[PDB]
Amino acid sequence: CLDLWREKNDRLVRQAKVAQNSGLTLRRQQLAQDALEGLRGLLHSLQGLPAAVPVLPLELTVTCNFIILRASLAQGFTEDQAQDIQRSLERVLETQEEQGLRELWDSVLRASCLLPELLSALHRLVGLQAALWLSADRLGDLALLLETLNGSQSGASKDLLLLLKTWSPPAEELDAPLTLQDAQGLKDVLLTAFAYRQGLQELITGNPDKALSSLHEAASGLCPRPVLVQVYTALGSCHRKMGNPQRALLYLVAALKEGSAWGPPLLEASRLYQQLGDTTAELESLELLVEALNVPAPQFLIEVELLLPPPDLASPLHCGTQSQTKHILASRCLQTGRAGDAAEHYLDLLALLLDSSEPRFSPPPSPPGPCMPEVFLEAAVALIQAGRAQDALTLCEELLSRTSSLLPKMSRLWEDELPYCPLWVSATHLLQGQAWVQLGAQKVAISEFSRCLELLFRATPEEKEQGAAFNCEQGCKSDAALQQLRAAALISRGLEWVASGQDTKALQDFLLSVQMCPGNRDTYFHLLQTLKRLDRRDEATALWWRLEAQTLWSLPLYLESYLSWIRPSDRDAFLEE
């Protein structure tokens, strides 16, 4: 019977390995699932009996080869494999010598200290279950288990790395029933994977000195080129954080050469050149990164990639899609004052997003970043700063066309805090006004500014009474954004009153903006210029004292850029006069 079971296990192992080595995308997974059903049925057959000692090391070889091919296909460990380990462990325990895995492992290793000839399969089981606890982030008790495997008086070694180094493979693995992977091949994997994890965690938690050692450890040894790229990229990040630019650049070049996936290196390069202030090189790096991301095997085995965690946003290895980077390029081109280039970039972005019906999808930025209207606003700001106001009106028209059904019916306009209008509707009218200003149309400009102001005061964006949809969490809610935007529209109206010769109305608007946002100082500059024109002495000084009594948090970019555009260069010079 055991001859048949062992030939069957060897047969399914040969089948799975043929599938790994050969085949196409279907036939591979088909053969793998067939072998998986085979190993499931064979485990059932072996577990049907009250198995003895010589049935044990075949049953365990089957269990290990079954969990391997389970997790290589599911592409992640879970708890069914852990419960299968528990089943096999109670099967080892009730033959010779219950509550949970830690004490069960301690007692099973006590039984193994009696030296039954299955330590080659126990070490393999330990490899798989150490992989499971690592991918499950169960880091503490893994040290306890490995400390129980090795000598007990080496318990003072709390660091996992030396303990994993000391954990040997038990034997040269003589002619036992065949297996998919040996415990040394699992050891190297566990080493590099844990080293990577500890290094990245130390990077993210502000230990970019400690991270270098772990990452160099992950580099030295079995390190597949795909993971070697990520290591070099993380070392570049660590050096860039410390200050050292040149070692960083060296690692990044290594990453580019070794890599078939050279996005995150160029992202980190850009984040470095931003620290140095070489803005031109930053933009050139991002220009390359887009073209790079333009271009678009699962082995039946336990590799490193299976164990490494999917990355976070704080990581240097987060690289979003071409669209989510084309937005970085355009945003960073607009923040610096290259608004013509930024306009072309933003129109390219909107072309990608809205002409996406037939081909593979290109997504918008993520909802830490801007919502989809904020993108249009940023586009229009860019087109204003370029000198393309007759395009900055067509942007805004298409935005309001597309969201007509969402806009409020402005019957509260007739009935005059309570009703709801999100910031971007008001902001649309604002930009739509400044466009007409640049085209020279006082009347319709003031019309649009007044419409923005009505929507700003006769409505609340922070109506989180009924959660009815998807909404902007942060950008189109901020009270700071509301007050800055109120002030912006008041100022942009007052300057047109100045142009028309209605300085009293202008004074009313500037005064109201000062009442609204007392910490912008553009308000005070405009107000004091007007008071210096009309009635200099007393009122000016009265507001000087207010300024020096007074003496950015998280604004949207369409507002930041609108303010930087309208503000005059001669601000502080006039404010010390």
Q: Which of residues 182-241 bind another protein (CB under 8 A)?
A: none
Range 238-277, binding another protein (CB under 8 A) = 244, 246-247, 249-254, 256-257, 262-264, 266, 269, 273
Smallest separation (angstroms) from another protein to the CB of 509 = 27
Residue at token pair 């982030």: 137
Nearest-angstrom CA–CA distance, 56 and 178: 14
Sign of CA dihedral 281, 286, 287, 288: positive
Range 67-96, binding another protein (CB under 8 A) = 74, 78-80
Smallest separation (angstroms) from Zn ion to the CB of 425 = 11
Identity at 23, one-letter amino acid code: G
| 29 sits near another protein (criterion: CB under 8 A) | yes
537: partner contacted, choices Zn ion, another protein, none (Cβ within 5-8 A by kind): none
Strand positions, DSSP E, 301-417: none
Radius of gyration of the chain (CA): 33
Judged by CB, which is closer to another protein: 366, or 541? 366
Give the bridge partners for 420, in sequence order: 460
Q: Which of 152, 153, 411, 551 lies at the binding interface for another protein (CB under 8 A)? A: 411
Total residue length of the chain: 577
Nearest-angstrom CA–CA distance, 87 and 92: 9
Judged by CB, which is closer to another protein: 395, or 485? 395
| 156 sits near another protein (criterion: CB under 8 A) | no
- Answer yes or no: are the C-beta atoms of 188 and 162 closer than 8 Å: no
- Answer yes or no: are the C-beta atoms of 263 and 319 closer than 8 Å: yes
- The three-state DSSP-derived secondary structure of 351-419 is HHHHCCCCCCCCCCCCCCCCCHHHHHHHHHHHHHHHCCHHHHHHHHHHHHHHCHHHCCCCCHHHHCCCC
Smallest separation (angstroms) from another protein to the CB of 373 = 6
- Show the tokens assigned to 234: 């993380």
| 295 sits near another protein (criterion: CB under 8 A) | yes
Residues 6+ apart with CB under 8 A from 263: 289, 292, 293, 319, 325
Q: How many CA atoms lie within 13 A of 153 on its CB side?
A: 0
564: partner contacted, choices Zn ion, another protein, none (Cβ within 5-8 A by kind): none
Smallest separation (angstroms) from another protein to the CB of 546 = 39
Q: Which helix (H) or strand (E) holds 404?
A: none
Smallest separation (angstroms) from another protein to the CB of 300 = 14
475: partner contacted, choices another protein, Zn ion, none (Cβ within 5-8 A by kind): Zn ion
Q: Which of 114, 115, 409, 576 lies at the binding interface for another protein (CB under 8 A)? A: 409
* Other Cβ atoms within 10 Å of 301 Cβ, number: 17
Binding mask 454-483 for another protein (x = CB under 8 A): ------------x-xxxx------------
Nearest-angstrom CA–CA distance, 93 and 87: 10
Short-list 72, 84, 82, CA closest to 42: 84
Nearest-angstrom CA–CA distance, 8 and 518: 81
78: partner contacted, choices another protein, Zn ion, none (Cβ within 5-8 A by kind): another protein
Q: Which of 20, 88, 214, 324 lies at the binding interface for another protein (CB under 8 A)? A: 324
Smallest separation (angstroms) from Zn ion to the CB of 374 = 5
| 352 sits near another protein (criterion: CB under 8 A) | yes
Q: Which of 41, 140, 337, 363 lies at the binding interface for another protein (CB under 8 A)? A: 363
Q: Which stretch binds another protein (CB under 8 A): 6-14, 46-54, 361-369, 527-535?
A: 361-369
Residues at the interface with Zn ion (CB under 5 A) = 371, 374, 472, 475-476
Q: How many residues line the site for another protein (CB under 8 A)?
A: 92
Give the bridge partners for 460, in sequence order: 420
Q: Which of 152, 153, 357, 554 lies at the binding interface for another protein (CB under 8 A)? A: 357
Smallest separation (angstroms) from another protein to the CB of 78 = 4
161: partner contacted, choices Zn ion, another protein, none (Cβ within 5-8 A by kind): none
Nearest-angstrom CA–CA distance, 390 and 252: 43
Residues 6+ apart with CB under 8 A from 176: 57, 61, 120, 121
Nearest-angstrom CA–CA distance, 13 and 32: 10
Judged by CB, which is closer to another protein: 383, or 482? 383
| 439 sits near another protein (criterion: CB under 8 A) | no
